[PDB]
Amino acid sequence: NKNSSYFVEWIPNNVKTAVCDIPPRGLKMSATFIGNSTAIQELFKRISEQFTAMFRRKAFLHWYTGEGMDEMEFTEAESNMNDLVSEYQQYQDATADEQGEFEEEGEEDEA
Amino acid sequence: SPGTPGSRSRTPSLPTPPTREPKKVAVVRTPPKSPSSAKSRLQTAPVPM
Asked: Does B34 sit within 8 Å of A56, measured CB to CB?
């Protein structure tokens, strides 16, 4: 109710609960979260860049073609990672609404 | 060369070391292998009506 700006409007009631009667050894009670948030997209935004920073100069790469992979393999693997940046970006701020009925105006254009 | 009567001194003077020579030496040879890449992405979620 508080963190409404942190949930996704087209997935109602965002929780899977489970509850075991049995605590840890010595603990009264405890909790364990799992969350799947678009907010982890930073990792993939940085590592595809920290890797790009290497491929732009082909730095260290000869240790890796040194085991018989191809110079293509690492671009394939960054490009697999770029599409997963689009994957987090496409559910960011997302809506689910009617088609050909509308096209968007905001409230002002000028900064 | 003209000079004193009788025996005169017998002097060679050809300097052994090489002169100035074509060895400039300091030229760029092997820059590290460096490709630029423009890159692109296109968001592709489910889009029904």
From this structure: yes
**Method by which this entry was solved:** cryo-EM
Containing A79, the helix (H) or strand (E) segment is: helix A73-91
DSSP letter at A60 equals T
Beta carbons of A46 and A85 less than 8 angstroms apart = no
Question: Of B27, B16, B8, B45, whose CA–CA distance to A90 is shortest?
Answer: B45
CA B12-B17-B22 angle, to 5 degrees, is 135
Rg (CA), chain B: 38
Mutate to test the interface with B, among A56, A74, A92, A98 (most CBs of B within 10 A): A56
Report resolution (Å) to 1 decimal.
4.1
